[PDB]
């Protein structure tokens, strides 16, 4: 676990990146709002737990050929119950990536 990369990079057209992520969000039944053309706030109801989780997506330019999609979790507001805000953020990200990218 040497080299950690912030989000994921693409040389696809930014218009195509946003279009596809919005398509995936809709496909996964997440709700979303467009803050900027390159900035989305998304919300998902957990099917098992019934809780809500929120995250932000932000597209950045890193080269003249290269873009980076950044994901950020949004904070809310004896044996464990179902749920982990942190692990669910990971799953949300992985689900969005799988269903919109490569």
């Amino acid at each position: 676990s040497m080299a950690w990369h912030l989000g994921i990079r693409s040389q696809s057209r930014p218009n195509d990146i946003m279009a596809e992520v919005c398509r995936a969000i809709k496909q996964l039944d997440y709700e979303w709002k467009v803050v900027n053309p390159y900035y989305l706030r998304v919300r998902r109801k957990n099917p098992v737990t019934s809780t809500f989780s929120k995250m932000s997506l932000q597209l950045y330019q890193v080269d003249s050929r290269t873009y980076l999609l950044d994901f950020r979790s949004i904070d809310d507001e004896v044996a464990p119950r179902p749920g982990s805000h942190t692990i669910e953020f990971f799953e949300m990200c992985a689900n969005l990536i799988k269903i919109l990218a490569q």
Binding site: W4, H5, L6, G7, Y60, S73, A94
Partner: protein, 73 residues
């Protein structure tokens, strides 16, 4: 009743913003033997042998945990 004209800045959002609100593209962590607010952001290793490794640092009160999830794709 004259026709009205629209002035469109068009390109405030020509291209995605350039990166750094000091967000580092790469964090290099070596087990040899802070960074202000990359808090809550997703990091990942290169996919190896069909396993994703997702990571983020979150705050609980005054304590910080960097959680890594190993997950098959």
């Amino acid at each position: 009743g004259q026709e009205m004209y629209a002035f469109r800045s068009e390109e405030r959002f020509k291209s995605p913003p350039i990166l750094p609100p000091h967000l580092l593209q790469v964090i290099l962590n070596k087990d040899t033997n802070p960074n202000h607010v990359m808090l809550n952001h997703l990091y990942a290793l290169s996919i190896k042998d069909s396993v994703m490794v997702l990571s983020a640092t979150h705050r609980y009160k005054k304590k910080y945990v960097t959680t890594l999830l190993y997950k098959p794709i």
